[PDB]
């Protein structure tokens, strides 16, 4: 399922047979190294690419799986807020002020 | 059943601490780690405990992986951070059952941690200077105590400190980075252990290669070679051609790792080279880097100045042996310490004691900012934070106060692990550090450690038990972060 | 929780020790092993009892491990080690309940062990080595009460001839010795008296066609793990051998007749299908070196090995009698007989006496057994404890009190009362200055130990005491076991 995303990111065309397999048929990257974090998990760091088109990655860490999910949800919430700023151009003050104002 | 996941998580924290609570300290009791297959292990340090401890509750998993993170960051302190975190969790759970909303607790804990690290970076000890030797020799003696060498242990503690000062090798960043393997072990027979002494260079016990090689050589070029010098049936027989060719390049003192030769006598007389076999591989690599040279296998055809240096090689009677006193190399790395007596079997524990004294002294030498160990830091922090909680004045007074009270569990566990009355000893420590702040003239009362030999309050800067500042700072930070993360988790009901 | 796990550990130790408490001495009470298949087992050896039985408690498993190690390290006394450990833990139980930390208890135990190590050497009687008279007395004393009663002559002569054939002068004077490099040749056939001793290594493997000069006046053995082929089209090994000109070459695979003739041209005797468990002693007896890199080949590759080789055929077996080799460090002891049903135990007792001789070289000391040494060390500890102060003195006395379990069991498993005999032994031992009386094991009657004539090597008793004390401190230093089950 991640094949399409990887091909979109690092610009690798899919290869099904050895007949038409070449280097430019794939997508190159500046650096590809594996590191160890705390000795309990190995994450590959393919840092830098020739054409990293519309893609970033953050190694979301945390105390547990679930608080890591919380950090992911926070990041996606920020992304979606930015998207809402893009689509709709109308800003209001927050922090409970709009709710109490509209209630009054 | 449970009534609050806060209670369940703090019970998990209390259990995971109580498992590892006892093992803290050099006098900690070992733990019996059984597994499914029955291959049981015994250990006394918390890192080895938590690396293979079978955990089941998610809060326990979080705590143990924070512990692993701290261990991978700074090393020592896993037990301390786990214990402090569990104490903070249980105190904060009691305080939240005291009807305090947890976010105020988190804010108070963060403020207390900030104030604590600022205090530590302000009331530490900078004794790790060239003027500090009495404290260092005292620390070496105390770590070396309880042995039959205590009569002459003073000289050993005096020689180790200035040896590691001398053998200290600076790095590319202009900071002291002592290589532990630079100091090499050395056996001796005849005279007992009280006649041992410091040698500024490695001395290998081997056969006399030749007698024409003088004690001091102005120009030495180590053309170290693995192959022996023998005649068989750039040279087919490795006896003359490469040796003379590199002599033309300037190889004067050649440390031939290979075997002896029948006609090597004249060549060693005219050049001044040695042939020594059965050289320990770590010692060979150290003398290679001490002399600033690499290991050459063959010499088939660089040779200009890369060859190593052995300026002074004393050829005399040392411990009724003709040890090759290869010293004064280009890089001050090659040295060794004699171990007299009869042989190494009974003094192997003496060898390990010398190794651990070297290790603790060299760790003290690094991390120039240092703090007194043995619970003095914890008592001083408690005294500071007790006043700071009232001075700050917002609704986090209780949070900061219980953070201060929770910090005094490390002296408690050290005291109980040393068979002494925990509460009495920690109360004595607390009262001693009260004068550090209330009395402005008692400034030099801030390092009352815990002399575990007798379990009595004692000056510790003189004693010399030391902890790197970074270790304590990161330990406190990680404990506070773990406490905040666990307290921020309550989204279950059980 | 807390000390409860310590109490459980020491309870397991006590309940595993007392199982075979009664099975030591010349009148050991015999035990039952009932497998859940209807079978019934006759056994006296407590070591065999514990090996056959299986237990689940991990502390008991560790004690099984230490017992096995002591069995495979110095020899006998394993039952005594287990009994001592169990008694010391049982007596430490009372102090653990006394609400004192295990640290002070183990410190007291360490000091007591240090005192015992010295007081053992204080009371040990000197012995001489190679002195046939009282060495044979020791053979009749301790090497007996095995199945060699009617055959003690063969065991004694074998031991006395083979004491000086595995000695290693590495760092001292023959104090390094092993019982494995000796060539024991246990083959049935003929009478038991056919066993002999030879100065060399024997091989049960031999060439299929020994119609050749297998023996040379000075064989130069070189180990080689490669197998010779017909030719390069490897023959190159033949010329490589020819370069240094040896006369004997060892390989682990067969050699063809054409290859055999090629090696005859190479002036070397090819030996095939050798075994590593025999190749190691071949190299030890001959000082061989193995090397195949052409650049590293030098004059040191081939060295002098045997001195007088020969091959005979006894009992239609392709023997290989290398004798009078260079190093008398891995020599031969022959083992023949009509049947092998006891000779294995015979050679086990031979290795026991070999350890006896090796430690006699280490320390020419004998301790008065039969409870004499135990009572002597207990008395020394009790009298030394009078000056001791502090709470740690009570364990320093309880270790001595619990060490008298050996004579207690000896008296118990002979019918005699275990109370009156012990009280009489203790009371008279104190007033006695340098007597060291030891209770007879058979009659269960008090007797001066010199008259009875029983002794043990100092090293074995020292190792037993050290292992018992270290087991006690290890089992008392455990604070918790929870890591799963
Ligand atoms: N000689 C000593 N006297 C008193 N306390 C000591 C001594 N040496 C070390 N300590 C204490 O040991 C504690 C750290 O040990 P620990 O955290 O158990 O090591 P690890 O993290 O490797 O398990 C420190 O707080 C220090 O006070
Ligand atoms: N004739 C004897 N009289 C008294 N005690 C004896 C006699 N023979 C052996 N013993 C006792 O037996 C003990 C040795 O038995 P042990 O080494 O435990 O046998 P194993 O190790 O084979 O179980 C010695 O301590 C010794 O006191």
HEC string of chain A equals: CCHHHHHHHHCCCCCCCCCCCCCCCCCCECCCEEEECCCCCEEEECCCECCCCCCCCCCCCCCCHHHHHHHHHHHHHHHHHHHHHHHCCCCCCCCCHHHHHHHC
State which H helix or E strand residue B283 sits in: helix B281-290
Distance CA C233, CA C150 (A): 64
A41 lies within 8 A of chain B by CB: no
Ligand with the closest atom to the CA of C27: 2
- For residue C58, the distance in angstroms to the closest alpha carbon of chain B comes to 8
Give me A104's structure tokens: 């009054």
Strand partners, B313: B326
Annotated active-site residue B43? The verdict is: no
What burial class does residue B89 get, using C-beta atoms within 10 Å of its C-beta: 0-12 exposed, 13-18 middle, 19+ buried?
buried
Tell whether C76 is in a known binding site: yes
**B29·C298 Cβ contact <8 A:** no
Distance CA C88, CA C471 (A): 10
**C104·B23 Cβ contact <8 A:** no
Residue pair C63/C449 in contact (Cβ under 8 Å)? The answer is no
Which residues does C184 contact at the CB level (< 8 Å), separation at least 6?
A: C333, C335, C347
Distance CA B242, CA B226 (A): 13
What B456-459 contacts at long range (C-beta under 8 Å, 24+ apart), as own/partner pairs, is B457/B425, B457/B428, B457/B429, B457/B432
Annotated active-site residue B79? The verdict is: yes
| Cα dist from C164 to A51, C284, C305, C467, whole Å | 80, 15, 19, 29
Distance, CA C392 to ligand 1 centroid (Å)?
25
Question: What is residue C194's DSSP assignment?
Answer: G
- For residue B294, the distance in angstroms to the closest alpha carbon of chain C comes to 20
Pick A64's closest partner by Cβ from B62, B69, B72: B62
Cβ neighbours, 10 Å, residue B316 = 9
* Three-state DSSP class for residue B155: helix
The structure was resolved to a resolution in Å of 3.7
Residue pair B364/B466 in contact (Cβ under 8 Å)? The answer is yes
Backbone φ and ψ for B217, nearest 5 degrees, come out as: -125, 125
Name the nearest CA neighbour of B406 among B309, B480, B339.
B480
Evaluated on CA atoms C96, C102, C107, C113, the torsion sign reads positive
Size of interface A-B (CB pairs under 8 A): 21
Residue pair C205/C273 in contact (Cβ under 8 Å)? The answer is yes
Q: Closest-CA residue in chain B for C59? A: B32
HEC states along B315-336? CCCECCECCEEEECCCCCCCEE
Q: Calculate the CA dihedral of residues B52, B54, B60, B64 and round it to 10 degrees.
A: 10
Evaluated on CA atoms B456, B460, B462, B463, the torsion sign reads positive
Name the nearest CA neighbour of B491 among B1, B52, B9, B30.
B9
Among left, alpha and beta (phi > 0; psi -120 to 50; other), residue A30 is alpha
Tell me which chains share at least 3 CB pairs under 8 Å with chain A. B
Nearest residue (by CA) to ligand 1, atom 17, is: B77
Distance CA C378, CA C436 (A): 12
Question: What is residue B216's DSSP assignment?
Answer: B
C79 lines ligand 2 (CB under 6 A): yes
Best mutation target, A63, A67, A74, to test chain B (most B CBs within 10 A): A63
DSSP B388-417: HHHHH-STTHHHHHHHHHHHTHHHHHHHHH
Which residues does B329 contact at the CB level (< 8 Å), separation at least 6?
A: B201, B287, B290, B291, B292, B308, B309, B310, B311
Distance, CA A67 to ligand 2 centroid (Å)?
67
Backbone φ and ψ for B131, nearest 5 degrees, come out as: -75, -20
Residue pair C195/C187 in contact (Cβ under 8 Å)? The answer is no
The CA angle C482-B69-B126, to the nearest 5 degrees, is: 110
> Which of B21, B43, B51, B80 for mutating ligand 1's site (highest number of atoms within 8 Å of CB)?
B80
C440 lines ligand 2 (CB under 6 A): yes
Which residues numbered 58-97 in B keep a CB inside 8 Å of some CB on A? 58, 61-62, 65-66, 68-69, 72
Residue written as tokens 């514990």?
A: C50
Residue pair C197/C184 in contact (Cβ under 8 Å)? The answer is no
Q: Which atom of ligand 1 is nearest to the CA of B463?
A: 1
Distance CA C369, CA C377 (A): 12
Name the nearest CA neighbour of B255 among B215, B292, B219, B226.
B226
Tell whether B311 is in a known binding site: no
Annotated active-site residue B78? The verdict is: yes
Give helix C152-162 / helix C343-362 axis angle, nearest 10°: 40
Backbone φ and ψ for C135, nearest 5 degrees, come out as: -65, -45
The residue length of chain A stands at 104
**B65·A40 Cβ contact <8 A:** yes
Of the residues B162, B356, B421, B424, only one is catalytic, namely B356
B5 lies within 8 A of chain A by CB: no
A81 lies within 8 A of chain B by CB: no
B298 lies within 8 A of chain C by CB: yes
Distance CA B333, CA C222 (A): 41
**B68·A64 Cβ contact <8 A:** no
| Cα dist from C360 to B458, C128, C438, whole Å | 50, 8, 22
Which residues does C290 contact at the CB level (< 8 Å), separation at least 6?
A: C222, C223, C224, C225
Q: Which atom of ligand 2 is nearest to the CA of C25?
A: 12
Distance, CA B32 to ligand 1 centroid (Å)?
21
Distance, CA C379 to ligand 2 centroid (Å)?
21
Distance CA B286, CA B293 (A): 10
The experimental method behind these coordinates is cryo-EM
Pick A64's closest partner by Cβ from B61, B69, B72: B61
Cβ neighbours, 10 Å, residue B426 = 24
């Amino acid at each position: 399922e991640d094949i399409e995303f990887i091909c979109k990111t690092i610009g690798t065309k899919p290869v099904a047979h050895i007949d038409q397999f070449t280097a430019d048929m794939l997508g190159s990257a500046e650096l590809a190294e594996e590191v160890n974090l705390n000795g309990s998990g190995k994450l590959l760091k393919i840092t830098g690419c020739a054409s990293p088109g519309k893609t970033v990655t953050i190694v979301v860490r945390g105390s547990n799986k679930l608080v890591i999910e919380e950090a992911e949800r926070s990041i996606h919430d920020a992304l979606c807020v930015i998207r809402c700023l893009v689509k709709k151009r109308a800003l209001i003050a927050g922090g409970g002020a709009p709710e109490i104002e509209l209630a009054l | 059943t449970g009534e609050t996941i806060r209670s369940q998580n703090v019970m998990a924290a209390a259990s995971i601490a109580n498992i590892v609570k006892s093992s803290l300290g050099p006098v900690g009791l070992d733990k019996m780690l059984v597994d499914d297959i029955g291959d049981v292990t015994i250990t006394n340090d918390g890192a080895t405990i938590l690396k293979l401890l079978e955990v089941e509750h998610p809060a326990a998993k979080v705590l143990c992986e924070l512990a692993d993170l701290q261990d991978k960051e700074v090393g020592d302190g896993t037990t301390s951070v786990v214990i402090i975190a569990a104490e903070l969790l249980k105190n904060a759970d009691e305080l939240v059952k005291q009807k305090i909303h947890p976010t105020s607790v988190i804010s108070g804990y963060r403020l207390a941690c900030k104030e604590a690290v600022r205090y530590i970076n302000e009331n530490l000890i900078v004794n790790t200077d060239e003027l500090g030797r009495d404290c260092l020799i005292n620390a070496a003696k105390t770590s070396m105590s309880s042995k039959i060498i205590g009569i002459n242990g003073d000289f050993f503690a005096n020689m180790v400190v200035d040896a590691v000062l001398a053998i200290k090798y600076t790095d590319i960043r202009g900071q002291p980075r002592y290589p532990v393997n630079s100091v090499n072990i050395l056996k001796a027979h005849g005279r007992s252990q009280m006649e041992s002494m410091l040698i500024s260079g490695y001395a290998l016990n081997c056969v006399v290669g030749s007698q024409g090689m003088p004690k001091r050589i102005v120009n030495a070029k180590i053309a170290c070679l693995d192959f022996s010098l023998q005649k068989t049936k750039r040279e087919s027989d490795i006896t003359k051609e490469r040796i003379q060719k590199i002599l033309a390049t300037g190889a004067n003192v050649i440390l031939t790792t290979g075997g002896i030769d029948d006609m090597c006598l004249k060549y060693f007389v005219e050049a001044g080279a040695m042939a020594v076999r059965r050289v320990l591989k770590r010692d060979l690599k150290r003398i290679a880097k001490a002399s600033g040279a690499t290991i050459l296998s063959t010499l088939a055809n660089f040779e200009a100045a890369m060859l190593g240096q052995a300026e002074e090689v004393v050829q005399e009677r040392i411990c009724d042996d003709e040890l090759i006193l290869i010293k004064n190399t280009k890089a001050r790395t090659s040295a060794s310490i004699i171990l007299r007596g009869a042989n190494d079997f009974m003094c192997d524990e003496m060898e390990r004691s010398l190794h651990d004294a070297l290790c603790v002294v060299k760790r003290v030498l690094e991390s120039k900012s240092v703090v007194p160990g043995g619970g003095a830091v914890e008592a001083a922090l408690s005294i500071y934070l007790e006043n700071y909680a009232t001075s700050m004045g917002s609704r986090e007074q209780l949070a900061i106060a219980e953070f201060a009270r929770s910090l005094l569990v490390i002296p408690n566990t050290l005291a109980v692990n040393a068979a002494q009355d925990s509460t009495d000893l920690v109360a004595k420590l607390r009262a001693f550090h009260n004068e550090a702040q209330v009395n402005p003239e008692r400034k030099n009362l801030k390092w009352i450690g815990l002399d575990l030999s007798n379990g009595k309050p004692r000056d510790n800067k003189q004693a010399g038990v030391f902890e790197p500042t970074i270790v304590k700072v990161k330990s406190l930070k990680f404990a506070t972060e773990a406490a905040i993360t666990i307290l921020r988790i309550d989204d279950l009901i059980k | 929780s807390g000390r409860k796990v310590q109490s459980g550990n020491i309870n397991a130790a006590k309940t595993i020790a007392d199982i075979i408490r009664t099975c030591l001495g010349p009148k050991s009470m015999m035990k039952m092993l009932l497998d859940p298949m209807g079978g019934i087992v006759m056994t006296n050896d407590g070591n065999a009892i514990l090996r056959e039985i299986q237990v689940q408690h991990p502390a008991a498993k560790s004690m099984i491990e230490i017992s096995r190690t002591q069995d495979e390290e110095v020899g006998d006394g394993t039952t005594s080690v287990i009994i001592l450990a169990g008694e010391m833990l049982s007596v430490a139980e009372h102090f653990l309940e006394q609400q004192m930390h295990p640290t002070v208890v183990i410190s007291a135990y360490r000091k007591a062990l240090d005192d015992m190590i010295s007081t053992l050497k204080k009371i040990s009687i000197p012995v001489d080595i190679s002195d046939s008279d009282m060495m044979l007395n020791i053979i009749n004393s301790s090497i007996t009460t095995k199945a060699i009663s009617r055959w003690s002559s063969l065991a004694c002569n074998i031991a006395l001839d083979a004491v000086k054939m595995v000695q290693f002068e590495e760092n001292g004077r023959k104090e390094i010795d092993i019982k494995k490099y000796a060539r024991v040749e246990k083959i049935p056939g003929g009478i038991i008296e056919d066993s002999c001793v030879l100065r060399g290594v024997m091989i049960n493997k031999d060439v299929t066609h020994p119609r050749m000069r297998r023996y040379i006046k000075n064989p130069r053995i070189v180990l080689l793990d490669s197998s010779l082929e017909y030719k390069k089209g490897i023959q190159q090994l033949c010329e490589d051998i020819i370069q240094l000109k040896p006369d004997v070459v060892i390989t682990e695979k067969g050699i063809s007749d054409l290859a055999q003739h090629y090696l005859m041209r190479a002036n070397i005797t090819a030996i095939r299908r050798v075994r590593k468990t025999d190749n190691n002693r071949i190299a030890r007896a001959c000082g061989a070196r193995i090397v195949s890199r052409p650049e590293e080949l030098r004059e040191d590759d081939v060295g002098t090995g045997a001195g007088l080789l020969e091959i005979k055929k006894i009992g239609d077996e392709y023997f290989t009698f290398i004798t009078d080799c260079k190093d008398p460090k891995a020599c031969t002891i022959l083992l023949r007989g009509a049947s092998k049903e006891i000779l294995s135990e015979v050679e086990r007792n031979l290795q026991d006496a070999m350890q006896v001789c090796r430690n006699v070289l280490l320390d020419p000391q004998l301790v008065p057994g039969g409870g004499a040494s135990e009572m002597a060390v207990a008395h020394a500890l009790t009298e030394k404890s009078k000056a001791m102060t502090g709470v740690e003195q009570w364990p320093y006395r309880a270790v001595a009190q619990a060490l008298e379990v050996i004579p207690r069991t000896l008296i118990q498993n002979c019918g005699a009362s275990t109370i009156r005999l012990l009280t009489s032994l203790r009371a008279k031992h104190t007033q006695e200055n340098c007597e060291t009386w030891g209770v007879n094991g058979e009659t269960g009657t008090l007797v001066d130990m010199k008259e009875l004539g029983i002794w043990e090597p100092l090293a074995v008793k020292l190792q037993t005491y050290k292992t018992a004390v270290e087991t006690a401190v290890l089992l008392l230093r455990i604070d918790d076991i929870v890591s799963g089950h």
